[PDB]
Design a protein around this ligand. Structure first.
Ligand code: RHQ
Lengths: 181, 185
């Protein structure tokens, strides 16, 4: 029954973490105070990141076959990253959470959510070493970089023409990938 | 000095209490000023904050100009700048008040000046890349884009890697600086 609440949450969060609150989440939704018990707010929010992280991650599975090689897949995952409505449009809300509501158990809990977000790149780079497109020496490192680099392009340019955004991402994808060969 | 005092008191107020918490009345009283003189200079708390952010911006470029003497070549400069940016986040106090503000207003009016404010930060790369071209450290026939990219690539690495110990994160950032810079030839 209580799956309805998440829609108002995902919606509201993408106003921010601070601005949205347990009151708004219930009253603007119609559900008892107790019924919402994921116990804490940071347990609710952290749950939403997974449903959106998964949604994106299965959209990428459904769209990546168009990329024939791994080199194309890298370009594409980064392009698609800009256009998706999953995960990446919450990233602002995380930055607040990252640097405010962080209990020590929450840190370790959502580190698994981090490792999920790199595995897109981990698979790609490993497969490149396999399919013979390049030779990475420390992949899990190079993935952490490519990912966070990319997240940077996506998040910190949410205020200009979308055709341009894609061009800058493409250029990055090209530079980065070339730095490995 | 009543303008500068307000900015100065506002800053330390924001640092201690955060954007949303700090009130105009507090700023007014503690700087021994008046709501009028505040409205005259700044109009809104929204704007006052931007002026602080611009003062700090200039302190940064001032700081950089001094620190970059340490790095001889433009290759070295690029490495060092990206490091400095990474180390910063750990102890910059306005950090938290900036995240509040940034998310509370990104209004096409307020967002206008926030963009103009990042262009000064991008101009740092723009120089490094430009000057590297002239000494022949690389060939970039498109210095403005690659500047935009580098800026946001670094900022992404700084901001979205708040789990590891500082040793590891400097190791990553330099590995990025290595890969990126390498793939320009
Ligand atoms: C020892 C002095 N250390 C400094 C450290 C700083 O760290 C910053 C970290 C950040 N971390 C991510 C949230 C963001 C956004 C801005 C920062 C600024 C900053 C603030 C206002 C305007 C521009 C900048 C800025 O960095 O750009 C200047 C060109 C900043 C400024 C100074 C002086």
């Amino acid at each position: 029954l209580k799956d309805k609440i998440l829609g108002v949450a995902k919606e509201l969060f993408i106003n921010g973490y601070n601005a949205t609150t347990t009151g708004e989440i219930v009253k603007l939704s119609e559900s008892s105070k107790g019924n919402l018990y994921f116990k804490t707010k940071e347990n609710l929010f952290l749950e939403i990141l997974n449903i959106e992280e998964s949604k994106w991650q299965e959209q990428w599975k459904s769209e990546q076959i168009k990329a024939k090689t791994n080199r194309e897949k890298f370009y594409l995952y980064n392009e698609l990253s800009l256009t998706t409505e999953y995960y990446y449009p919450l990233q602002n809300a995380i930055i607040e959470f990252y640097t405010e509501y962080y209990t020590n158990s929450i840190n370790e809990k959502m580190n698994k959510l981090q490792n999920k977000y790199i595995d897109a790149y981990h698979v790609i780079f490993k497969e490149g070493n396999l399919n013979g497109e390049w030779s990475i020496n420390d992949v899990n490192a190079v993935s952490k970089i490519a990912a966070n680099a990319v997240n940077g392009i996506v998040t910190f340019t949410h205020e200009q023409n979308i055709n341009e955004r894609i061009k800058l991402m493409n250029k990055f994808s090209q530079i980065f990938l070339n730095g490995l060969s």
